[PDB]
Enzyme design. Structure first.
Site, short mmCIF file in Angstrom:
data_model
loop_
_atom_site.label_atom_id
_atom_site.label_comp_id
_atom_site.label_asym_id
_atom_site.label_seq_id
_atom_site.Cartn_x
_atom_site.Cartn_y
_atom_site.Cartn_z
N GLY A 1 0.81 -1.23 0.00
CA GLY A 1 0.00 0.00 0.00
C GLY A 1 0.84 1.27 0.00
O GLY A 1 2.08 1.17 0.02
N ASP B 1 -1.86 11.56 17.84
CA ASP B 1 -2.67 11.07 16.69
C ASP B 1 -3.01 9.60 16.90
O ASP B 1 -2.93 8.81 15.95
CB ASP B 1 -1.96 11.28 15.35
CG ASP B 1 -2.92 11.33 14.18
OD1 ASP B 1 -4.15 11.40 14.37
OD2 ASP B 1 -2.41 11.19 13.08
#
EC number: 2.7.11.24
Length: 347
Positions: free
Chosen positions: A22, A139
């Site tokens: 990916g 995050d």
């Protein structure tokens, strides 16, 4: 130079038998055979040197991951780059191959209470270390929790991480924020820069809720909608919690809203372990001062099968000062990345 989706994915003698797994932030990700350790590894190709921002996030991530050593934090095993600054256009980061992430897993799999408990334990064990280094992740979300085939969990993606700075945490109402909306603490939308440890505990709380139901608990569609979602479950903030918001615009916004009652967690999560819901309550506390700390969470009855503070290490070498990266030119940042990555050279 070896090619993949060709572009260049050039990872030296050591790493062969590449497979595209990916795209990432500033380049692509492949698995590869590490011919030296005889295991498949993950390799991320990074091309940040055009953009001050890409350089800052790359340098932050490399500095932190090289300093940290913890079972629940992804390690950097190797870094591949040209031998000179002039020839360095890209950097490849070699990490343990983790077959999936909690984002991908929650797309299709129901978690057992035992899986939820073990995953939450590992998240908080890693987060204890991070916070003990005076670092905020900022995050935390399911896609930044890597899992391997034996459900070992590793936190990744420190690109938005900062040294904690509670003194300088205050800001105006509606201050722009980078980290994924659905995992942001209520105070980010009100009066917080996200420079205190309590912002990470909120994100863990969001992740716990998501593990209990396989859906995000606060899927806000916009910046203020994130807050209507939070208050639609938690209910209207108490006078006490409002009194802690001295920013008039933020306090008056909350005062403008119609009264909302608390939705009981057992109504939202009727299949959930009662102890998991008690801990969820304490992590998704509106007031960041009253919010549970990482070490308190690890000590909660929900996690009693795993809790062992002697096996929950803290960082030898905390980041005592701000890494003053915000106003460094690209060219200096490239030099720092070059220097930061020098230990992996034959050189």
């Amino acid at each position: 130079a070896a090619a993949a989706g060709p572009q260049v994915f050039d990872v030296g003698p050591r790493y062969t038998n590449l497979s595209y797994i990916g795209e990432g932030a500033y380049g692509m990700v492949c698995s590869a055979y590490d011919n030296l350790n005889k295991v498949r590894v993950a390799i991320k190709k990074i091309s940040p040197f055009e953009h001050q921002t890409y350089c800052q996030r790359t340098l932050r991530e490399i500095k932190i991951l090289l300093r940290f050593r913890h079972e629940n934090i992804i390690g950097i095993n190797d870094i591949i780059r040209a031998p000179t600054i002039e020839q360095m256009k890209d950097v490849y980061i070699v990490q343990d191959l983790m077959e999936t992430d909690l984002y991908k897993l929650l797309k299709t799999q129901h978690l057992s209470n035992d899986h939820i408990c073990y995953f939450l334990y590992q998240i908080l064990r890693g987060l204890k270390y991070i916070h003990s280094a005076n670092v905020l992740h900022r995050d935390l979300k399911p896609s930044n929790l890597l899992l391997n085939t034996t459900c070992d969990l590793k936190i990744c993606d420190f690109g938005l991480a900062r040294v904690a700075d509670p003194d300088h945490d205050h800001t105006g109402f509606l201050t722009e924020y980078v980290a994924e909306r659905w995992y942001r603490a209520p105070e980010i939308m009100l009066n917080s820069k996200g420079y205190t440890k309590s912002i990470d505990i909120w994100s863990v709380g969001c992740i716990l809720a998501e593990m209990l139901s396989n859906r995000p608990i606060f899927p806000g569609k916009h910046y203020l909608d994130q807050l209507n979602h939070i208050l639609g479950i938690l209910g209207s903030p108490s006078q006490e919690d409002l009194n802690c918001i001295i920013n008039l615009k933020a306090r008056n916004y909350l005062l403008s809203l119609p009264h909302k009652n608390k939705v009981p967690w057992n109504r939202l999560f009727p299949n959930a372990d009662s102890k998991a819901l008690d801990l969820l309550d304490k992590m998704l506390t509106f007031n960041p001062h009253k919010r549970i700390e990482v070490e308190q969470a690890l000590a909660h009855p929900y996690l009693e099968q795993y809790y062992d503070p002697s096996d929950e290490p803290i960082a030898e070498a905390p980041f005592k000062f701000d890494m003053e990266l915000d106003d460094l030119p690209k060219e200096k940042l490239k030099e720092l990345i070059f220097e930061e990555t020098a230990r992996f050279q034959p050189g």
